[model samples]
Target: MERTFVMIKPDGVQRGLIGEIISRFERKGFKIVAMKLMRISQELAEKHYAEHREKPFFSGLVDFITSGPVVAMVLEGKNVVEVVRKMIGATNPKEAAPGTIRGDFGMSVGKNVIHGSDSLESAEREISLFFKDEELVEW
Candidate 1:
């Protein structure tokens, strides 16, 4: 089995897509081992998106993420990381395919409604940040 990280960004939360998004994951058969609805601090946002710090959009990204609450979750399944990434679709919704999460719900790249871990390492690192060891329960 594999574990992956996914977040419904502030945009999605504000737009009331939380349950709809979770339903998609649930329907996919990925077990939601840990999940939360929480607001992120500036510190957490910067740290979470540190890899993009060197780029110009770093500050804007942080600003939006910290604007409202988000839904962060850890999902477990076989090959979940890559599968979730594809389900999330392209970073630019315009470039995403019709059946994808982003493609169906998002309008702008700047306000993409969701984020998925890019790789296994990213999943582990992100899961650790948003969730605690005791929070993940296998059923």
Candidate 2:
């Protein structure tokens, strides 16, 4: 089994897509071991998107991500890190296929609707950033 990080961006929350998005994961047999609804601070956003610090839209990107509350979650399942990534689709909505989340709700790369860890390492780092050891529950 594997665990991965996934977040419903502010755009998704603002647009009321949280229920639909989470339902998809539930239907796919993924277990949501942890979840929270909170606003991302500027400090956290900078670190979360640190890899993009050198990019052109860094500041704007950070602000947008922190604009409102987001839904952060840890999902567990086989090959979850890779599987969730595929389900979320590419960064650019136009390039993402119809069945993917981005393709359906994402209007632009600027607002891709959601975020997910691209690798197991990233998953661990991301999960640590927003969650505590005790926050993750097992059943």
Candidate 3:
């Protein structure tokens, strides 16, 4: 099985949608190998969103993620990274299709309700950032 990282951002957590977000992956048959709700430090935030460093929203992105507790998860399933991204919809909710996570509950790019690893490489990198090897299980 492939593994990927997904997170219910601070906004989602504050809005009390943690279970709602997790249920989407659970209902889709992905295995939750690891999960935790943690307050991110600024250093971790910058490291996590490093790829977006040059983007205009980078600072706000880091600030928002570290603002409060967020749910981080490591999910395992075949092609889950791609599947979850589709379920999460576009980065910009305005462009996201109906029925997708962002389309249903998100309002803007910065406030998009969830984040899923964008590729296999990213999945591996992100999973490490949020979880240690012993933290995950192989089924």
Candidate 4:
């Protein structure tokens, strides 16, 4: 079993795609262990993407993330990290495959519609960043 962190970014929520996104994962048989609709604080955003801190996109990424509410989640299933990343598509929507989430609905790298933890380490880091241990349900 594995777990991953996924988020419906501000753009996705604003465009009303939360249900569509959630349903995709649900129909795949992944369990939603924890979830929240939250407005990102600067500190949280910085920590969430800390590895990108020195990247040129850092400021804009943080600003855009805090612009509105985002949907954060912890999902559990077998090989879920890579599976959800495929479902999310590339970071740059232009290069993403058409059947994937970003490829179908996103238009920009900065505004890509979702984010999924890239690896096991990332999943653990992100899940901890957004959720406490008690927030997760094992079933």
What local lDDT score does residue 130 receive in model 3, on the 0 to 100 scale? 84
In model 3, the runs with Cα more than 4 Å from the true position are none
Which scores greater on TM-score, model 1 or model 3? 1
Q: What local lDDT score does residue 136 receive in model 3, on the 0 to 100 scale?
A: 80
Rank order by lDDT, top first?
2, 4, 1, 3
Pick the TM-score winner: 2
* Candidate 1 Cα outliers beyond 4 Å, as residue runs: none
Clashing pairs in 4: none
16-43 per-residue lDDT for model 4 (tens digits): 9999999999999999999999999999
TM-scores for every predicted model: 0.97, 0.98, 0.95, 0.96
The CA lDDT at 11 in model 4 is 97
Q: What is the Cα-based lDDT of residue 58 in candidate 3?
A: 90
Whole-model lDDT per candidate: 0.92, 0.94, 0.90, 0.93
Model 3, total clashes = 0
Tens digit of per-residue lDDT, candidate 2, span 3-84: 9999999999999999999999999999999999999999999999999999999988998999999999999999999989
Q: Which 10 successive residues of model 1 have the least lDDT summed?
A: 129-138
- Across 8-101, the per-residue lDDT of candidate 3 in tens digits comes to 9999999998998888888999999899899999999989988789998798899899999999999888989999999999989999999899
- lDDT winner between candidates 1 and 4: 4
